[PDB]
Structure 1
Amino acid sequence: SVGWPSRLSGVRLHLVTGKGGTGKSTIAAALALTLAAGGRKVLLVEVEGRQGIAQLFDVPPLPYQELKIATAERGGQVNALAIDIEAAFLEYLDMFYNLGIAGRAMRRIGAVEFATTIAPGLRDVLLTGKIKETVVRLDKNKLPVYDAIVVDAPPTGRIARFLDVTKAVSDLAKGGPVHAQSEGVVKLLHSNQTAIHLVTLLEALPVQETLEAIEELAQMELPIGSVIVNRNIPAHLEPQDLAKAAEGEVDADSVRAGLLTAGVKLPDADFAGLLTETIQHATRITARAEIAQQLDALQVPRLELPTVSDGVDLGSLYELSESLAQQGVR
């Protein structure tokens, strides 16, 4: 029944997936804010070069550096890392093969863009490898630099392949240092230090993809965290009144009586119109509940976030973080 079991508080790596447009970026930032509260330091990571963090915080494009982007409750801190795949490839060539010179020459002729584009496995090795480096990084006192890492991850249709370290490494050169580092990446991803959260909307396709992703991830023995149901709406009607209204039955006599009590007398065209407005609302709720029922089969914790009435601004991220905190996210 809880949306956040205690085990999830021990997790250092949070991966936020879900279908496009369900709220991965918004919720990964709200999750980062929640985990940073109480003088903690959390890293918010994006991996597709889309600059979604900068767009969310309404700031210019972020460079390839970990930078403070938000102050969490009671002295907490959220740092941002927009991974630059081109700069990550040069970092890799220089650190693992001492080809920093070759790398710098490739950048001047657009060859790094090419190599990362023509080899999707190399791309995923660079990205998951950098994610692992942020997770295991220690300070001067052998203590973790970050309390948690939150990844605004690829969508539900790409998440299983993105975390498939064995398939990504298969198209890379045999031997060297990469094949040794990949073992540590696999170990981290499959441990109790990781959790994959799946953002969904109460719509057919986001729910279907959530189910299909959980199945693919369970087969890979990858740890599932929570299902996060975004943009919930108020029912406004009691279960019995809703079930009837979804069929076209709203007793008007009771409605007309309750309107007279509040000092409201409506004409026949406005009263009939008011009734079909509630039938249509109840038809929308019923259909959403029918879609939501498909998730009941999963023995996975579920979290719920409301709809922010206007556009998602900085203040909206704090309201969603507060909504997560009230549900036990810590």
Structure 2
Amino acid sequence: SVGWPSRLSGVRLHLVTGKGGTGKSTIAAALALTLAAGGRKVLLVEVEGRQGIAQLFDVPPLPYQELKIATAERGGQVNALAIDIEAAFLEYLDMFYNLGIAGRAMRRIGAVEFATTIAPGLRDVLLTGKIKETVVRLDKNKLPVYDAIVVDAPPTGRIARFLDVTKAVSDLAKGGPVHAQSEGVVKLLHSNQTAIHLVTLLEALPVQETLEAIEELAQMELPIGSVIVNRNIPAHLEPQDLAKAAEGEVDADSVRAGLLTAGVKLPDADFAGLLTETIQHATRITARAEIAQQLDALQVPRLELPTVSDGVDLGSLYELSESLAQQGVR
């Protein structure tokens, strides 16, 4: 029943997945705001080089630096990290192989771009490796720098492979320190310190991808958090009236009667039009409920977010953060 069991409050790494266009970026930002409230410090991470955080906050492209992007309720802070895969590869070459010289030569000929494109496993190793670094980082007092890390993650069709450390490591050079680090990544990912959240719309393909992704991840023994149902709409109709209206039956007499009380008399062509509008609404809610029912089989907590009327802006992220907090997200 609860959309956020208490165990989810002990999670340090939140991965926000879901089909393309379902709300990952928006929801990951709203989640970060929710977790930062009350003097906390949360990192919002993106891994695909798409600059979705900059686009969402309507600012120029962010550099490879953890920077304050938002103020949360009661002195909380949200930092942003748009991972630059090229700078991450040079950082890796320098730290684990002392190849900073070779790396800076490669950047000048586009060879870092080539290498990350032709070796997808190296890409995931650098990305998941950086994610782990922000999670386990400590201050001078041996306390975590961040209270939580929220990853605006790859979509449902790619999330299981992105988190497949064994498969990513498979096509990398044997021996060295990269294999010792990967053990730490696996431990972190397969623990009570991580949770994968799945954003969905009440549409056929986003729901099918949600179910399919949960099954791949459960098989991988990766921890599932919540299913977040985005852009909910009001039914505005009672269950019996709705079920009837989805069949074309609307009680005109009862509608004509209630319109008299409200001081409204409608012509026949406009009254008929008003009735088919409610039939069309009822048909949409019914179809959405049939789609939603497919998620009932999952013994997974579920959260519901409303539809923002106009373009999602800064104020909208705070409304969605507030909606999450009301459902017990903390």
Q: Normalized against structure 2, the TM-score is what?
A: 1.00
Distance of 1:12 and 1:184 partners within structure 2? 15
Shift of 1:214: 0.1
Q: Deviations over 1:125-149 (max 9, x none)?
A: 0000000000000000000000000
Mapped partners of 2:22, 2:238: distance in 1:
27
- Report the CA distance between 1:57 and its aligned residue: 0.3
| Alignment correspondent of 2:302 | 302
Distance 2:56 2:171 in 1: 35
Q: CA deviation at 1:66?
A: 0.1
Partner Cα distance (1:133, 1:229) in 2: 30
Query: CA offset at residue 159 of structure 1?
Result: 0.1
How much has 1:95 moved relative to structure 2? 0.2
**Displacement, 1:170?**
0.1
CA-to-aligned-CA distance 1:98-153 (integer Å, 9 cap, x gap) = 00000000000000000000000000000000000000000000000000000000
% identical equivalent positions: 100
Question: How many aligned positions are there?
Answer: 330
- Give 1:242 deviation, angstroms: 0.1
What is the alpha-carbon distance in structure 1 between the residues aligned to residue 226 and residue 282 of structure 2? 28
The answer for unaligned runs of 5 or more in structure 1 is none
Find the aligned partners of 1:193 and 1:234 in 2 and give their Cα distance: 35
The structural deviation recorded for 1:29 is: 0.1
C-alpha separation in 2, matches of 1:171 and 1:316: 43
Which residue number in structure 1 is paired with residue 189 of structure 2? 189
Q: Give 1:284 deviation, angstroms.
A: 0.1
Q: Tell me by how many angstroms 1:291 deviates.
A: 0.1
Counterpart CA distance in 2 for 1:11 and 1:262 is 52
In 2, Cα distance between the equivalents of 1:303 and 1:118?
A: 38
Q: TM-score, normalised by structure 1?
A: 1.00
Deviation at 1:156, TM superposition (A): 0.1
d(CA) in 2 for partners of 1:9, 1:296: 23
Q: State the 1:307 CA deviation.
A: 0.1
Q: CA deviation at 1:238?
A: 0.2
Question: Post-superposition shift, 1:17?
Answer: 0.1
Q: Which stretches of structure 1, 4 residues or more, deviate above 6 A after TM superposition?
A: none
Aligned counterparts of 1:171 and 1:266: Cα–Cα separation in 2 = 71
Q: Distance in 1 between matches of 2:264 and 2:196?
A: 51
Counterpart-to-counterpart distance in 1, 2:309 and 2:252 = 30
Give, in angstroms, the shift of residue 224 of structure 1: 0.1
Alpha-carbon distance in structure 2 between the residues aligned to 1:73 and 1:270: 48
Tell me how far 1:279 sits from its aligned partner. 0.1
| CA-CA distance at 1:223 after TM superposition | 0.1
CA displacement, residues 69-102 of structure 1 (integer Å, 9 cap, x when unaligned):
0000000000000000000000000000000000
Q: Name the SS for the 1:71 alignment partner.
A: strand
Structure-2 separation of matches of 1:260 and 1:38: 52
Unaligned residue ranges in structure 2 (runs of 5+): none
Paired with 1:54 and 1:244, the residues of 2 have a C-alpha distance of: 46
SS in 2 for 1:74: coil
Q: How far apart are the structure 2 equivalents of 1:267 and 1:190?
A: 64
RMSD (Å) for aligned C-alpha atoms = 0.2
Q: CA deviation at 1:308?
A: 0.1
Q: Note the C-alpha offset of 1:34.
A: 0.1
In structure 1, distance between residues paired with 2:250 and 2:21: 35
Give distance in 2, aligned partners of 1:270 and 1:260. Answer: 15
Question: 1:253-306 CA deviation, whole Å, 9 max, x = no partner?
Answer: 000000000000000000000000000000000000000000000000000000
SS in 1 for 2:167: helix
The CA deviation at 1:60 is 0.1
